[PDB]
Amino acid sequence: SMKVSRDKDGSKVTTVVATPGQGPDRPQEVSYTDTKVIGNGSFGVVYQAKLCDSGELVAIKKVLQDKRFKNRELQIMRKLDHCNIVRLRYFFYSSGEKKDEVYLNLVLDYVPETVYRVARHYSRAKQTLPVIYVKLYMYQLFRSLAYIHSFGICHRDIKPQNLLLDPDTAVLKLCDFGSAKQLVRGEPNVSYICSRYYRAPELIFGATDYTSSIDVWSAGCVLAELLLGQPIFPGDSGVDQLVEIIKVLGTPTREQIREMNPNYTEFKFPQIKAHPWTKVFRPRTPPEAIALCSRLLEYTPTARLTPLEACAHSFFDELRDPNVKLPNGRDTPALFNFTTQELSSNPPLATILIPPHARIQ
């Protein structure tokens, strides 16, 4: 049930009764107006709306509700609370004319930009994003990956379109969990998740026993794309994607193929040596960024850095400097308020992750 109405200057106003995303189930009277679509596709429509009272902008994701099982994205969104993940404020059910079908609406934070759009603005003008922003955007993404992985949840669709951005505050928030799923060892999972360009090689090889390290590969493809100005492993087919991976990483040894897809899909690749990673990027590319890419984009999934280990990489040392600031003068967003949940994968890493100045009493 929803109650449509108007204000007194015009302005159509919708009022729903929604459940808080987190906390106890205390129903909520939420009124919003100025509804405008901000893109759809597959899952459904994603709207933008303005809250009537406070005037804040929010996003509403409207998908079809399977009457059999409850929506998996909703069960995950309610378990999550992190500064680098888009927050589920409320959620409610509704319809739309007859249909006899139920729609699930997820009221989330609104963030005005995406990494895809920002990287495209710089790419169209023949230039790359300033490295300080690349450090800030990837650190916050690796922080969000270390959080959901602590719960065993794999995003399974890391791409620049799913990385929201506030340009003023440099805050990054991961969004779109319609492909996320808790990965339990011994259980199989579908191999056709994740978008092109960013699929881990074990996904291209059709493996079903993959771990959360596929998110680390996809995040590594985002970092290299921001450095190169174009996707590092493009291709319209899995064969084309693999060729671009062989071009950089080299031919995968037989033991590396076993770690990816143990099924051995029965293919023989051309033998190409290892592209020295320094030749892949621009001349003035920071070598620490090149070092991070090589440690994220590894054939062997267990050899890739964990999200928490990526945050502690030397490429992010500038963010731990006490005098670091955004170019526009403001302070950096919160980068060191780690929780025990966040550090559970490797608590001793807090000796590096939390700089001394972040502990000044």
Among 46, 200, 293, 311, binds ligand A1IXM (CB under 6 A): 46
Distance CA 210, CA 319 (A): 32
Contacted entry of ligand A1IXM, its own copies, none for residue 327, CB cut-off 5 to 8 Å set by kind = none
114 binds ligand A1IXM (CB under 6 A): yes
Contacted entry of ligand A1IXM, its own copies, none for residue 244, CB cut-off 5 to 8 Å set by kind = its own copies
Task: Say which of 157, 168, 176, 240 is annotated catalytic.
Answer: 157
Among 50, 61, 143, 199, binds ligand A1IXM (CB under 6 A): 61
Distance CA 257, CA 244 (A): 16
What letter does residue 332 receive in the DSSP assignment? P
Minimum CB separation of residue 86 from ligand A1IXM in Å reads 5
Distance CA 163, CA 156 (A): 13
- Of residues 66 through 95, those in contact with its own copies by CB under 8 A are 66, 68-69
Site string for its own copies, 203-222 (x = CB under 8 A): -xxx-x--------------
Which residues lie across from 13 on neighbouring strands?
Answer: 5, 33
Distance CA 95, CA 237 (A): 38
* CB of 61 or CB of 149, closer to ligand A1IXM: 61
Q: Which residue has the tokens 């693999």?
A: 242
Residue 168 is among the residues annotated as catalytic for this protein: no
Pick the closest to residue 261 from 215, 213, 206 (CA basis).
206
* CB of 71 or CB of 285, closer to its own copies: 71
- How big is the CA angle at 21 (ends 15 and 5), to the nearest 5 degrees? 5
Distance CA 270, CA 234 (A): 18
Distance CA 148, CA 154 (A): 7
Contacted entry of ligand A1IXM, its own copies, none for residue 49, CB cut-off 5 to 8 Å set by kind = none
Of 109-117, 210-218, 258-266, 282-290, the segment contacting ligand A1IXM by CB under 6 A is: 109-117
